[PDB]
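Researcher: Batch entry, complex prediction.
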Amino acid sequence: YRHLALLCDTMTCRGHLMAITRHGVNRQDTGPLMKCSFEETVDVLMEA
Amino acid sequence: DDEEETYRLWKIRKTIMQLCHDRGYLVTQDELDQTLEEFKAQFGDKPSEGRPRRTDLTVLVAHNDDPTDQMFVFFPEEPKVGIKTIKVYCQRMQEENITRALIVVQQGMTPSAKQSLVDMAPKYILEQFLQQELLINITEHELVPEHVVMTKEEVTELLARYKLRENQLPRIQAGDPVARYFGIKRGQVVKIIRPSETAGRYITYRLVQ
Amino acid sequence: XXXXXXXXXXXXXXXXXXXXXXXXXXXXXXXXXXXXXXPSLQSALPFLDLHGTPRLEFHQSVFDELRDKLLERVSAIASEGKAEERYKKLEDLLEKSFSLVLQPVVMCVMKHLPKVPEKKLKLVMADKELYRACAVEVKRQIWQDNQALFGDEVSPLLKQYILEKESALFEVVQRLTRMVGKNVKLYDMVLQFLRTLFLRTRNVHYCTLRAELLMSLHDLDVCHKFTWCLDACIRERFVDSKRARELQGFLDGVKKGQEQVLGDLSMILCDPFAINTLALSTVRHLQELVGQETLPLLLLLRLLALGQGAWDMIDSQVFKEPKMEVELITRFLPMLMSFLVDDYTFNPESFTKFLQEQRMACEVGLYYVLHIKNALLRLLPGLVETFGDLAFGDIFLHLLTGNLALLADEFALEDFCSSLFDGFFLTASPRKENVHRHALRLLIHLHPRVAPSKLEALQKALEPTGQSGEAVKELYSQLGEKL
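Model: Structure tokens for the complex:
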């Protein structure tokens, strides 16, 4: 239950549904290197 | 239909009574759960152009302490509410000295009036609710755990014990239907008690953003 | 012990069974009988119990002392206070007071015993009632201690006030236990007697706990209800201004009050909670009017209401205090001078000196503006002149509030100036003022160039402080400093 609770708590620790894509992970303030580590790499760095 | 309308008006009345009681108001105990037949006796069993029409059952409640503030609840006659309808309610409120109020719209609000509701928010606060939101007290649902609004002293105690800031709490939307139910504003931490199958009880906290 | 109807017969048998023969069968037959239980069980008790004790049946009577008592509640809750069942309960209570010297009669009086014509006389015939005075407190304890027992219990209020005084130097359930048996007439008499006695003797601390006791009437216990509806906003909000403005408008349009407006001003008057609330609301309103730049009008009416509050207890049959519409600008000119010095230093001492030497509510207002470095360092000589000007009692509580604000500030030179102000006024200071000075000096010694001199001044305030509490607290502060 630790693992299910952690996953369901990271998706809802922002108030809305954080979908696990670029569209939900790359909309929270985490870091340009962290966000470019995921699937969109150049666009995150250009915006940052 | 006419029996369906008095059932629907009674369920909206019941949910508004439970909403005011969960929000921390003076709700009379028999009013908090009356029978449908008691509502039909008190109001008149014909919402179709008759005695339990709208604006008869505008519920005025005060607070359980500091009895000055009131949110005397509104029920518009028309389905689609507009600005020239809510300014009559603004006139009834500025006749009074009280700033909170709830309107219970039937169909959706015109979005100019949605902007208009925000256009007096420091002056006097207006919340709106559709009929479908108030045919079920969503805090009675088994998926919805116990939300409790915290006072500012308890928020200072919380942040001083865990040595964290308001930026760091997990948060909640302002248009969250439970947040809309309790009517909390931005920046107002909500403790949430829920049963956990691995510890028994878990109290989380949701600052409002 | 006590002698009932059967008890008198028992005593007569104990007298006439002392001599004259009368063999055991005849004696046991003439002695008594148990009409409820069967003779078969009474004869099998030798065959089964070997001379047991029948008190378990009396234990069942103790169960009856609950169970039929619930049946007494079944008499009380069904017919809405049945008069015939109440008369039967009164007759049973009379028989139990005559027979038992009284726990079942205690529970039968605690169930419901209003309108008993010989109830209070029967209780005053058993007027010892030491433990009975706390157990008979459902209905019988009301109106019997109003002569002298309420005066005996009044001293625990002063004991709790001394406890709060000792706790601030570092109740709720009891007033509910008093209000368990509590009616309108007894509460009105206790309130009137305590208000007259407090406004004669001290009029200092009793008003705060009286408002706290009136705030403990939330459980539907029934002017006074309007005083509760007024003081709900005083208790709930700490910085309430607009609700306080509505309350000032509600209490400004009063009628010809025959001591009711004076009672409302007494209840508002002397509460450190309510005084601090009114001072913080008046200072927040003054800051809001400075933000508007529209000084005189709502802060003036709030300050006039606070001044009428603070001047209530000096006389009886009075209305309020004067406004002084010319004096208010001269009192609030040093606010404008402090704002001008802050505007210069974020981008005059003689006016504050002359406005601080010509002096009630405005004094506490200027003391409560002291929480909110060149402007404070310039106004500090005006603070020295003020502390040399009046030198009142509660000014040390205002210095403690300024020390709490400075501890929220965390500044060295302000702390040194505050220690100099605390040191230079040891002439006519109380034990509480020197104790708070030593507690603040326990937070002192951030800098090591004056802290050894203050460690020597702790011993230099022991011999001159002839009060044993101040020197004991200095020794305890030295003990806590070495840990």
